[model samples]
Target chain A: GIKAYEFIFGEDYISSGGIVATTKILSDIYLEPNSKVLDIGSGLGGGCKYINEKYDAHVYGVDICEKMIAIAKLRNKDKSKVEFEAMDILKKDFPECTFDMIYSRDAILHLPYADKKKLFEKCYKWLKPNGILLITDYCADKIENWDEEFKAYINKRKYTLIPIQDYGDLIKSCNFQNVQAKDISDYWLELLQMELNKLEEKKDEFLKLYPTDEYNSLKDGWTRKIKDTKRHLQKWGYFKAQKMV
Target chain B: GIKAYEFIFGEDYISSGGIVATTKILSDIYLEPNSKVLDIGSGLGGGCKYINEKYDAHVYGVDICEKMIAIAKLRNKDKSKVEFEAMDILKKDFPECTFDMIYSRDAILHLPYADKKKLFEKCYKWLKPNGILLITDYCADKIENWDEEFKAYINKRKYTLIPIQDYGDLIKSCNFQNVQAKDISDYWLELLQMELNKLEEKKDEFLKLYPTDEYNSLKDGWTRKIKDTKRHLQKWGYFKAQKMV
Candidate 1:
C-alpha cells in the first residue's frame, strides 16, 4: 500500500524539516572535498543530495526498504557522487576504515532493538580515524515511564523506542570518542507543530490527491504526534561521536 | 611480598566492606533451593562464602591471581558449597546457559578495554534465561575531565576507567536486558574514610608488620583515594542486568 507518508513527505524527504534538518548536521561533520560518507537507512536521498552538492563529497546511501531505495535512486541524478542501494546494513560488508562520516536520520528507530550493536560495530569498523558519525533519530520517554498511549503508538508503528541518553552510552561503548547525545526534542516539537499547521493550511490542495479518509488519518496521525512531542512521550535524539582510534 | 591489603582486609575479605557489601546484593537475586552462580574475578573467596552461607546455593569462583586462589582455597571450610579456581574468565570455557547468576566485584577494570566484550559475551552465553549479572567495579569521571592525578592513578594501576553508564551500555550491547548503572560514589567515600580511620586506630598492630614508611605509603594511598572520590576523579560503579533472550 502506498501510504500517506509517501505523499506527506513529498519527493526526496521523509524526516522532520527535510533539507533544513539535513543541514543542521552538516556543521557537525568535517567537509573534505573527497570525503566518503555512508548514509544508513537513507530515505529519498535528500540528505545525500544536499551533502554531496555542498561538500562535493561522495555519498553511498543504503536503505533496507526497497521502495525507499527505488525512490532515492530516482532522485540520484549524479550516479558517481551520490548513489543509493537497497541493502540491510546488518548484512552489508563495509571494509574497515572506509568512510569519513556515517550519517543517519529518523531511521535507526526501525532497527531491531537488541541488534543495534551489529550496526554500531559496522560503523566503528568502517570509519576512518578522527572521522565522525552523526545521527538524528526518533527517541522516546524512558521505558519505565512510558504511558499507555505512547506504548500503543509504538506498537502501531512497530517502533522500538529507548531513552536518548542510552544512545550516547551505546556509542561510547562501541569505542567512539567524544560521544554527545543531544535531546533535540524541543526542535522536533517545533518542527511537528510547524508541519501540522502547514498540513491544515494546504488541506484543499491535499484533497486533490486523496479521499477525505486518507486526509483524516494523516491529520489525526500528525495531531497525536504533535501532542506526544509536547508531552515528551515522543522525543528526537541527536548523537554526534568521533572515531579517534 | 605480601602487600598490606592481605593484612588490612583480614584473612578472607578483600574489597570495601567485603562480606558485608557482598551480602548487600543478596536481596537482588532469586535464591532458589538449588541455584547455581558463577563469580568472575573472585578474590580470596569472601563473596563466595557469604553467598553460599546465606543462600545455601552452590557458587563457583574464578580468579587469575594464584596467591588469591590459594588463600581462597584455604579459606573454604565446606569445599562442596564454595569452590575456587585460578583461571582467566576470558579464556576459561563454561557451557552455554549454565548459571542462574554471574557475579563480579572490582575486577572487570582489570580486563583490557578493547577485549572486555569477550568476557561479557561469555557471561551472556553462559547464563540461564532471565539470569542476573551483578558487577561492582572502579569507574572514573568522564574522560574529558580527567586530571593529571587521575591519569597517573589509572596508569599506575593499568586500569581502564569509563563513565559508569558506559558499563551498563557495554553489557546491554552483549544482549542483556533491564540494564541498570548506578554511581555509588557516596558509599565508596564512606568506605574509604572508614578504612582510613581503622588504619590509624590500629596503628600499633599495623606497626608490628611494617615500617613507618610503609605505613606512610598506605596512608598516602588511602588519602589520595578519599580526595579522588570527593573530586569525582575516581568513581564506583554498580551494574545489574538480566539475561532475556
Candidate 2:
C-alpha cells in the first residue's frame, strides 16, 4: 500500500519539488496574516499546514479521499490550527461567504468544466467580498503531434485543459471582475526536469519500489513525455484567477 | 459612449495593444493551421477573427452579450469559416469532443470559481484528446495595502481576482493534469500605462464624447487605477493551463 502511494505520488512525494514550488508561489501571493482561508481538494494538507503555521492564517482543508485526509490531519496535528475534513467539493456543504481566501493547488483539473464552474461559484458564495482565490494547475500548450501514447495518457487520467482566456470568461460570467490568465508551461517543465534528475540519482530505489513490468511501461512513457515536453513537442499551461464582489 | 467604453476598457480601446499582445502570446503557443478552435465570451471577436483570418485555423465564437456577438458576426461576415453565436456556456449543449482547442481572454475572471471549473470541465468534454486550453486575465500579486481607490474601482466594476495558485489547483482538481500558473502583473501594468498615454492624448475627444460629471469621475477613477496598478500598489496576473487525458 505504501508502495502504491509512493508509486502514484513519487518518492519524497510530500516534499516533492513540485509541491514545494507550488507552495512558495502561493505563499508569495497570499501573505496576509490572520486571513481566513479554505484549501479545496487539499491532498495531504502539506500546503495547508505550511500556510497556517508560516503565515498565521486560519486554514481549513477539504478532500474526498478519507485516507489522504487522515494522513494530513495526523501530520499537521502539531500545528493544531489547520483543520482537515473529508468532503467532496463537488457536493460539499461549506457555508457561503465563509472564507477570506480559497486556495487549491494542482487539484481542480480532475473535475470537468461544469464542476470547475460550480466550485468557482461555491468559492464565490463562500468568500467574503474581495476575497481571493488562488489556484495552480497544468494548462494546455501547442503540441507538435497528437499520438497514441499521448492519447492514452490523457484518457487514463481523464485530462482536459482550457486556454487561459476561457478561464477569464468563466470568471467574468460568474460576476468576477479583473480576470487574468497566463502561460507557465516553461516553469513546469523546468521543475519536472529537476525532479527527474533527483529521481535518476535514486533510480535503483525507485525501481525496487516499482518492480513490475507495468512500472517500466509507466516509466518509459514518462521519459518519452518529458523529452517531448522539453522539446516543446507538447503543450501545457498554468493559470490564476480572482473572486471579487 | 466611445469615451465611456474607452474608460471601461482603458484608453487605447481602439488600438487594442493589450488585446493584440494577448493574442500574439496565444498564437505563439497554439495557433496551428489545422487546429479547430472556439472562443467563448469573444468580445467583439477581434482576437478570434484575427486568428481565423491570419492563422488559417477554423474559428468559432460565443458570447452572452448579444450585442457583442452581433458585432463579432458583423466583423467576421466576410470570413465564411468564422462563426459567432450568442449563447451561454453554462447550459452545456455543445457537441462533445468538438474542439481541438478552446481559448478565452480576460473573460473567465468574471465567473465564480465554481462556474470556471464547470466551464473547464465542459471544455474538457468538448475537446478532442490532447486539446489545449489557453487564457489571459488578471491575477493578484502579494501586496500589502493594495490601493484602496484601485480596489474600489475594481469593486465598482464588480470584478473578482484570485491568486495564481487557486486557478492551478482548480484545474488540477478538475482532473486536468500538468497545470501551471504564472504572474504577469507587469505586462498588465505596462498595457494599462500605454492605454493611459493614449487617453491623455485623447482627453479632449473623451471629454467631448462624455461631457458629464459622471464620465469625468469614471475617467479619473481609471487614471488613478492605472497609476496604482503600475506602481504595484495594485497587482494583476496571467496564467495558462492544459487539458490532458
Candidate 3:
C-alpha cells in the first residue's frame, strides 16, 4: 500500500493536490476568529497547520495511525493552537455542539457505508448549531457500471468508493443542513497534470530523494490516474454542510 | 404584476418551459407505473397530467391557491390518476412513507426559509423508503448581496429567495439521500430566450390574447429576467434526492 501513502503523498499529506489545492476549499468557506476545528484523518497534520495558521483557529487533529500522529504531534508541539491524537472516530465522544467546523480530506473513502453514516451522525452531534462540516474524499461512478481499470485501482489501494451521488445522500441523511456536493474529477485531472509537470521539470531534485525505479513508479501512477479520471471511473468528491441552528 | 402572470404565461400556467420543457427533468428520473406521487404546489395540473399520461401513475396535487386548484381540477376531469386539493403544506398531513415521489416546480420560492424546511421535513416523513423528491424552483444570490432591482423583483412577487447553495442544504437536512443541487439558470436562460423569440414569431397570436400594454410588460419581464440571470442576481435551483431504506 505504498507504505500506507507516506511514500507517495509525502510525510505531510496522504491526499492528492495537498496544501496548494486545499486553498480552493478554504476560499469558499467563512471562518470567524478563534474558531475551533476538528480535522478528521489529520494525515501528517498539513491541513491542521494550514487551518490554524489561516484563521488563528484552534485545530484538534485525529487519525487512526499512531506513527502519523507521532510525527504530527512532534511538529505541532510548539504550535499551541494545534493538537494531535490517534483514535477511531466512531468510538470517540465529544459534547454535542462542540466544534465550529469539522473538516476532513480524502480519508473518508476508507470507511464502509455504515461507518460513514455513523461518523457523520457523530459529526452532526459534535458541531455547534449552524456550524460547518467540510470534506473532500475519493469517489467514483455508480458501481454497477464500473470498468476494468477502476476495479483494479480500487483493489490496489484497498479502497471502496461510493458513487458521488450516494456520498451526498449519506451527508444529507445525517441531519446536516446546507449540504453541497460537487464531483471534481476534472479538477483532479488538472492537479495530476501539474504533478507530472513538476516531476519532469525538477527531475534532479526528485532523484536526490528517490531512486529511478520509485520515480518511474510514481510517473506511471500519475499517468494512470489521469486516464481513470478522464474515463469517469474515479472521482474526487467535495461536500460542505452545516448543522442547522 | 401584469394581472398576476395569467396574461404572460397563459391562462393555464405561469411558469416557463411548460410541458415540453418539463420533459427535461422527466428524462432523468425513474417513475414506476402506478407509482403514487405527491405534487407540491400543483400549478394548473400540467405536470400532474403529463406524469399520469406518461407513466399511468397516481398523482395527488396539493396547492395553497384555490384558483389554481380549481383550474387544475377542471382539466383533470377524465384523468382518474390525478387529484387536486387546496391546502397549506404545513397544515396538511399524510401517512408516513406514503408516496413514491414528491415533485414541485417554481412554487417553493414563495415559501419562507423556515416554512421550506418544515415542508421538506414533512416531505421526508411522507415519502416511502426509496421515494424520490425532485424540484425546480426560483433561486437567487445571497439575500444580503442582492441588488435593488432583484430586491424589487422579489417584493413584486411577494416572494423570498434562498441562494442556490443553501437549497441543497435544506434537502439534505430532510434525511433525503442522493441529494443533488445545481444552479440551472443557464438552461432557464435558454428557455427565456426561446420564449422571447416565440413572442416575436407569433406576434399576432399573442396580440389577440392581450393588449399592447400587457404584451410590452411581459416583454420587459423576460428581458429583465435575462439580465438578472446574467448578473447572478436571479437563479433557478434544481434538486433531486431519494429516501433511504
Candidate 4:
C-alpha cells in the first residue's frame, strides 16, 4: 500500500502533494530552534524530518501502523533529532505543556467525530502556551448531499468526514484561540489533478513494475476523486490555532 | 501610498498575500548556502530579506520605482546580505552565468509582450547552469472576451496580461528546461477574498486613519479583482524553470 501510494505521492509520503503539500501547509508556521514538536500520524516521517531540517526542532513522529513506523525508522537518518514510535496516538500520554507545536496532515479523518474532539482536547493539554496546532484533513459537504459513489467510497475507506466549519468548531471548543478553519477544496483539486497527470506520465514505467489491474485501479480512483471534489461532494480543510492559556 | 498598501498587504509587502504569498511561491525553490540571487522588481526588499534569511543567499533587489527602492533601503537591516537598487532592470548588466537564482513576484506584468520575452532571455543568460528562475505574475484570459471594467483596469495599470500557457511557452523559447507554467487562479481568488476580509476587519481603524473615499476606492478595487478572477477574466501565473545549458 505504501509503495504504490508513494509512487503517486512521491518518496516518503502517502499524502497528496507529498513534500510539496507539506511545504504549503506549513508556510506560516515557524518554530523556535530546538523546540519540541509532535507529528500525529506521521506516516513515513517525511514531515518530521522536514520539520527538524527547517526549524532544527526536536520532533517526535507517532503512527499506529507498525509497518509504516518500521519503514520510517529505516528511512530516518538522525534518530536523535527525529524519533518515530509505532503506537496509536490516543493511547500515548505526555505531560501538560510539552510540545511547542503539534501537526497532522490528512490523518485525522481516520478518526470518528467524537474521537477527533477528544484528540483535540488532548492536543490542547499537550501544547505549551502560545504553541500552534496545524492540521489539514479530509472534509466533505453535508451528509445529505453525498452521492452514492462518494458514500460508498467513504464507507470503504472508513473515513469520518465532517464539514469544514464543524471541524474548526471542534478545535475551538478545545479552547484554541485565533482558530482558522479554511475550506481549501480548490487547492485539493489542484493537487489531485497534478497527481493524476503524474500517474499518467508514469503509466508505461508503472506497468512494467506493477500489475495492470493496479494501475487501472489507481487511475479510476483518482478520476473519481477529481470528479467528486469538483462537485463539492468532497472537500479539504486547513485548520490553524494557538493555545493561549 | 506604501502605508495604505501595507494596511491591506501586511507589513513589508505591497503584493497580494504579502509574505504569505512569497513563502508559497518560494516553497520548492531552495538555494544552496551563500548562493547569489537576483530579485527583479523587488518591491520593499521584504522578499529579498526573506530569501537571504531562509537560504543565506546574497540577494540583489532591483526595481525601477525609485520611491519603492528608497523605502526598501530604509527598511532593510542587513544591507550587506540584501542589497536594493533603484534602476530599470533592462539597463542593468551582469556577466554570463552570474546568479544561482532569479526571482520576481507579481512584477513582470508591467512590461510589454516583447519586453517580457527579452527579459526572460536576459534571465536565461544571467543564471548559472542548473540555476532556477521562479516568477509569479498577473496573467489573464484571451483578449476579445475582456469585460469593460477589466479592459479599463488593464489600460489604467498598463499591465500586459497573457494567457498562462503563452507565458510558459515564452519561457520555453528562452531555452529554460523543465518549465512549469501553472495558472493558480483559484489561489489568486483565495488571496483576494482574504484581503477583502482583512480590509473589512480593519474598517473602523482604517476610517479613523484614512480618507473615507480612499477606503472606498481600495474596497472597490479588491471587489472588482475578486469578481474578475472568479469570472476567469483575470488569472495568476506561477512559472518555474531551470537553466540546463
Candidate 5:
C-alpha cells in the first residue's frame, strides 16, 4: 500500500513548488536571519532545508514515517546543517521552551480538535517568549449550509478538520498573542486544478511509469475533486500566530 | 536549498494529512475490491497504497520526482502489486481509453483554467466507457469581498485556488456524462483547526527536531490562515464526474 506521506509529496504531485513558496513566505514573515526553526511533520524535510538554505537558519525536521525521515535525511545529508528525525508530533519527549519558531504546512489537518488544542498549548510552552507559529492549511469559507456535505465527507474519511476561527480561538486559548488568520482557499483550488492539467497533459508518461489502471483512476478522481472544489463547496486557509511574553 | 520533494512532504505542512483523508474519501466513492485505478500526481504514491491496502484494488501512481519515486518503490516493495513511476501528468503520454477509474485529491488546485480543461479532455479520452472520476479539494465559497488580509495572506503564500461553478463548467465542457459538486467548507475548516491544535501540543518535540525560530514563525502564519478560512473568506469542495463513451 502507498504510505500517506507519498501521496502528499510524491514526485508527480503538482504543488511541489508550493512547499518552497510556503517557506519563502514564512521566512519573510519571521524576518530573521540565522534563527532556529522547527518543522513538525517534516515529511521529507523540504521546508527545513528551505529555511536553512534560504534564510541561513538552523533547521530540523521530524516525521512519523521512518522511510520518509530516511529520505529526508538522505536528501539533506549534503547540507550537513539540517537534521531530520522520525517522531510522532502527538508525543512529547523533547525539550521545553526550546524553539524560536514552529512551522507546518498542511500536516495538522489530520489531528483531532481537542488534541489540536493541546498541541497549541504545548507549542506555547515550547516557544521562546517572542516565538512565532506559522501554518498553511485547509479552512472553511463563509458559506451557509455548507456543513451537510462537509460533515459527510469528513465522516467518510474518519478525519477531523476545523475552520479558521476555531484555530484562532485555539491559539488564543493557548495564550498565543497576535494570532492572525488568513484565507487562501481560492489559491488552493487553483493549484489543484493546475495539477489536474499537468496530469492529463502528461498522461502517456504517467501511464508508462504507473499501471494504466492506476493512472486512469487518479486522473478521474482528481478531475472531479477540482470541479467540486471550484463550486464553493469546500475551502482552505493559511494561519499565523505568535507567543508573546 | 531544500529539494522540491522535501518541501512537498514535510511535516508542519498543513496539507499533509488532508491529502490522506482526501484519498480515503475517494476510495469510499469507488470501493470495488477488484477495481483498477489510476492516480495522477501520485506524489510518493500514498493514495494508491491506501486504496490497494484498504480495498484490495490494483493501483498505479505517477509522479515527477525521481527521488520521490525511489522512495515510493522502496516503501511499496513489500506490497509487490502496486506500480509507481516518474512521470508528468501535464503532457500527453498515456494511450486513449486506458483507465477504469481516475482519482486525484487536492492536486489539481494549482492549474490555470486552460490547463484544467485540457486535463478533463484527456481524462475523458483515457477512460473506458462509463468510467467514473472522483475528486476532493479546496473550492471558493459564496462569500462577498472576503477579507483583504486573508487575500494578501494567500497571495504571499502563492496559492491558486478557484471557484466551484467554474470548475463544474470545465467538467461539463469536457463531455463527461454527469457531474456533481458539493461544498464541504465547514468540515475542512474544522479539520484545519484541529490539526493546528495537534501541532501546538507537540511543540516541544518539534522544536528539538527543527530550528525553533522558523517553526514558531510558521505556526503563527498558520493560525492566521486557519482563522481566515473559517470566516467565510475561503472554502473547500468535493467534485465527481463520469466519462461515458
Candidate 6:
C-alpha cells in the first residue's frame, strides 16, 4: 500500500501532491540557517530532507512507524542536519522552547479528538517563542450528517475528523497566536483527480508492477474521495500559527 | 483601487493570484489547437491572452466594464486569436454547441441565484458535447450563521454567495456531467495573506504611488478577508464539469 502510494504521490512522499504540496505550503515560512525544526508523523522523511536542504536547517522527524523510519534513515545517509526516530510522538519529550518550527502533514487524523488536543498543547511547549506550527490534515463535515457508508469507512480507517472550523478553534485554545485554519478541499480534490488521471494513463505499467486488486482499490479510494470532497462530506484543512512571546 | 489591485495581482490581471492562478487552475485542461473558448466576466483579458497563447485556442472575453474592455482592446492589438467585448454576459448569445470551453474566474457571484442557474443552462446549450465548464467564484458559509458585519459586507459588494456545496448542486441541476465543486478557501487564504504580506513589504513604494487612504482601504479589505476566510464566513469555490453528449 505504501509503495503504491509513493508511486502516485511521488517517490518519497506518502501524502497528497507530495513534494509540490510541501513546497507550496512552506513557501512563506522563513527559517534562519541552522534553525531547529520538528516534523511530527514524518512519513518517509521527504519533507524533512527538503527542509534541511532548502533552509539549511536541522530537522528532527519523529514517527511511530518503524518501517517508515528505517527507509527514511536508509535514504538519508547524511545525518548531519536531518534525523529520523521511530518513536510515538505523544510520549516523546523535548526541552521547552526547543524548536523554531513544528510541521505536520496528513498525519494527525490518526489521533483521537482528545489526543489531538493533548498533542497541540505539547507542541506549544516544544516550540520557541514566535515559532511557527504548520499542518495539513484530513477533516470532515459534522458527524451527525455522515452517511452510513462514510461512517463505516471512518471506522475501518480509524480516522478522527472534526469540522475544520472546530479544528482551528482547538489550536486557538492551545494558545497559538495568529492561528489560521483553512479548508483546502478544493486543492485536495484537484490533486486526487490528477493522481487518478495519471493512474489511468499508466494503467498498463501499474498493472504490470502490482496486483489488479491493489490498483482497483486505489482507484476506488480516490474516486470515492473525489465524490465525497465535492459533496463536502469529506474535507482537507490547513493550519498555521505562531507561539507568541 | 483597480490599479492597486493590478499591482498586487500582477500586470494585466485583476483577480487573485493573477496569471499564476490561471496557470494552476488550467493546468489539467487540455485543448486542441484552434479550440473555441469563451471567458465570461473577463477582467482585463489577461486570462484570455494566456489561454490563447498557451493552448493555441481562439478566446472571446466579455466583460460589462467598458473601461476594462478598452484597456484590454488596447493591449491586445493582435486580434486574430483573442477578442474582448464590452457587453453584459447575461445578454450575450451564440449558436448552439459553439464553444469548446466556457470559463469564468472570480465572476458569477455577481448574479442572483436564479440568474446563475439560467446562465448555467445557457452554457450547457452553448458548449459542444464533452466541452468543459471551469469556474472560480466567491462563496460563503450558511446564511443562518452570517454575522451582521458579514451581511452588510455582502450587501455592499452585491455578491450572492451560497454555500459552495450548494453551488455544485446547482451546476449539476443544469445537466452537467461529472461536476466537481471544491471549496478552496485554504488556497484563497494563502493568496490573500501573501498579497497582504507583499503590500506591507512594499509600503513605502505603495504610499509613494497612491493616497494614504487608498492604501489603508486596501489593507483593511485584505485584513478583513483573511479573518473572514479563516472563520469560514467567506469562501472560494472551484468548479469543473463537462457538457455530455
- On lDDT, the candidate that comes out on top is 6
DockQ value of candidate 6 = 0.01
**Candidate 1, after superposition: displacement of residue B235 in Å?**
88
lDDT of 1 by residue, B116-159 (tens): 88889989999999888999998778566678877887889888
A1-245 per-residue lDDT for model 2 (tens digits): 22233343453341362465756567557557778888887877777877786789989999987646755665676775689888787887677778887888777767888988888888778887788777766555554465677667776898766656676676667766665565666766776666666666666644433333434545565577677676554444444556666
Q: What is the lDDT, from 0 to 100, of the residue A229 in candidate 4?
A: 80
True-vs-predicted CA distance for residue B95, candidate 4, Å: 69
**Per-prediction DockQ scores?**
0.00, 0.01, 0.00, 0.01, 0.02, 0.01
Candidate 1 CAPRI assessment class: incorrect
TM-score of each: 0.47, 0.46, 0.48, 0.48, 0.48, 0.48
Compared with the true structure, the alpha-carbon lDDT of candidate 4 equals 0.80
- Docking class for candidate 2: incorrect
lDDT digits (tens) for residues A43-110 of candidate 3: 67888998998898999999987556755675566898898888887778999988999999888888
- After superposing candidate 4 on the true structure, give the runs of residues whose Cα lies further than 4 Å from its correct spot: A1-17, A142-144, B1-245
Question: Which pairs in model 4 have colliding backbones?
Answer: none
| Poorest 10 consecutive residues by lDDT, candidate 3 chain A | A5-14
Give the TM-score comparing model 1 with the true structure, all chains together. 0.47
| Ranking of all predicted structures according to lDDT, beginning with the best and ending with the worst | 6, 4, 3, 1, 5, 2
lDDT of 2 by residue, B1-245 (tens): 12222332332252463465756567557556767888877777777877776678888888876545644564565777788877787864678778877888778777776788898888778887777777776666555757676577668876677777777777677666666666677776666666556666776654433323434555575577666666665345455556675
Query: What's model 4's lDDT at A190?
Result: 85
Summarize candidate 3's per-residue lDDT along B1-245 as a digit string, tens digits. 11333352442322442875678888977878879998888867888988888888999999987556655775577888899988887789999999999999988988888999998999999999989999999887745557787777678988978777789988898788999899888898988888777776766665444445555766787788888777777689899999999
Candidate 2 matches the true fold with a TM-score of: 0.46
Native contacts conserved, per model: 0.00, 0.00, 0.00, 0.00, 0.02, 0.00
TM-score of chain A of each: 0.91, 0.84, 0.90, 0.92, 0.85, 0.91
